[PDB]
Ligand binder design. Structure first.
Ligand SMILES: O=c1ccn([C@@H]2O[C@H](COP(=O)(O)OP(=O)(O)O)[C@@H](O)[C@H]2O)c(=O)[nH]1
Length: 451
């Protein structure tokens, strides 16, 4: 009667954490369910070792959560990756005390639908982003595949698109750049997302009160896999607290409440020397207390920037993002609009200033600013990747300073919507919330679809 689920996340510590935290919640919804996560490069990344070890070694983690390593070599393309999953799956169905409920794949792991079809087990997809991204990606896929459209026509275009999962026209400049590029880049990602509608169910990392209009549009197509908004899935306990820092907590305790603006740009926010100097100049002219996570310093910052901003701000490298946003001193967040960073800032009621860089962050910035109105914008169409030997585009310090001033105001319609949306996010995870029911409905359908 026991049902085992196999999760296949994309390589990296990030996508693994969201898979583990989501698995920990689904296990609490049915004691008959077990989850086995396939790790792409366990014995190669020491950060993935620590996370997998500290999770399995913890007595509070469920005993029904197993981590199995995928011994991927260097030359294995999609050919050999399929077999090493097919090998483990064939070993896992030999257990007569468990029924394989199916494969739950990542957005970049939809190639293993082949394996699920060979073993006559269902296929599922865990979308680590929001519903507005899913509907947009399927709209762009249907445009090229079903309407015979050259998606490069929207590249650097001032036109707007009528996307079904959006209540406002979506500018072509906020589209995911990899979908309007063409050639090998577009082909790689189109083969990733076009196989999603061929699954049984799609788990989305969002809640209904956030991206309503998109979820209704995704569910309207009955000829499509049912979507389960199980978010927000965050990279900490979501009930105890994230790991912090003493010297960090020391300085923020001295500043007033909602007075420090935090600046972080994810794990790939490598600006050029010019853009960093514009951010530092804007922080100087704003006069606001700031905490800047910057990835030497006196050679990349304006002359005397640290000297003039000594008692008002602090600059550093890597930052405990979730812990900093939880501090009462942080009242602003200049973010790259990553979905995890967006959900973290929403979980702690911190309003955001959009500085999107890569991936779907351009659409996430458009979603929060124009669609929902719960974020001030610095830019919506900024792209960090400069092609050829061309000079990178740069956002001026005046545009950054203006958005910080609007963000750190005592009262604003953005700050009120964020505080209101923060409670709607925390209620969605409590029993009876929208995402709680979605988790229970998902685990219910996984067991019922097996016969
Ligand atoms: O200095 C940093 C930068 C990032 N993060 C974490 O890295 C992720 C960044 O968010 P997201 O994955 O949406 O952005 P991306 O990694 O794609 O840039 C989140 O889990 C953050 O908590 C962090 O802890 N400290």
């Amino acid at each position: 009667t026991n049902v085992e689920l196999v999760f296949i996340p994309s390589p990296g510590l990030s996508h693994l954490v969201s898979t583990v935290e989501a698995a920990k919640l689904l296990l609490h919804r049915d004691h008959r369910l077990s989850i086995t996560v396939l790790i792409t490069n366990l014995h190669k990344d020491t950060k993935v070792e620590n996370y997998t070890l500290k999770t399995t070694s913890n007595p509070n983690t469920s005993p029904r959560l197993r981590f199995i390593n995928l011994p991927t070599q260097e030359e294995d393309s999609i050919d050999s990756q399929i077999r090493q999953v097919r090998e483990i799956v064939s070993v896992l169905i030999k257990n007569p005390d468990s029924k394989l409920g199916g494969l739950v794949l990542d957005m970049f792991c939809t190639s293993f639908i082949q394996v699920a079809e060979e073993f006559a087990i269902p296929s599922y997809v865990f979308f680590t982003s929001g519903a507005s991204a899913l509907g947009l990606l399927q709209h762009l896929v249907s445009l090229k595949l079903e309407h015979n459209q050259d998606l490069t026509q929207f590249k650097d275009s001032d036109v707007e698109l009528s996307v079904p999962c959006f209540s406002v026209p979506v500018p072509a400049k906020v589209l995911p750049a990899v979908m309007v590029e063409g050639g090998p880049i577009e082909d790689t990602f189109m083969n990733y997302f076009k196989r999603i509608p061929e699954t049984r169910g799609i788990m989305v990392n969002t809640f209904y009160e956030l991206e309503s209009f998109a979820i209704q549009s995704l569910l309207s197509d009955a000829k499509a896999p049912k979507v389960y908004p199980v978010g927000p899935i965050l990279g900490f306990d979501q009930t105890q607290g994230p790991v912090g820092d003493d010297a960090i907590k020391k300085w923020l305790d001295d500043q007033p409440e909602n007075s420090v603006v935090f600046l972080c740009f994810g794990t790939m926010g490598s600006f050029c020397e010019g853009q960093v100097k514009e951010i530092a100049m804007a922080l100087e002219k704003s006069g606001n207390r700031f905490l800047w996570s910057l990835r030497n310093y006196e050679e990349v910052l304006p002359q005397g920037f640290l000297e003039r901003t000594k008692g008002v701000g602090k600059v550093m490298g890597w930052a405990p993002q979730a812990a900093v946003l939880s501090h009462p001193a942080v009242g602003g967040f200049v973010s790259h609009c990553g979905w995890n960073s967006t959900l973290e800032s929403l979980w702690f009621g911190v309003p955001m200033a959009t500085f999107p860089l890569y991936a779907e962050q351009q659409m996430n910035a458009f979603l929060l600013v124009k669609e929902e109105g719960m974020a001030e914008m610095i830019t919506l169409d900024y792209k960090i990747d400069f092609k050829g030997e061309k000079q990178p585009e740069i956002v001026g310090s005046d545009e950054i300073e203006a958005a910080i001033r609007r963000l750190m105001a005592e009262e604003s319609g953005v700050r009120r919507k964020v505080k209101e949306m923060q409670n709607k996010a925390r209620s969605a995870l409590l029993e009876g919330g929208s995402s709680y029911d979605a988790q229970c409905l998902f685990v219910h359908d996984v067991i019922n679809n097996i016969g």
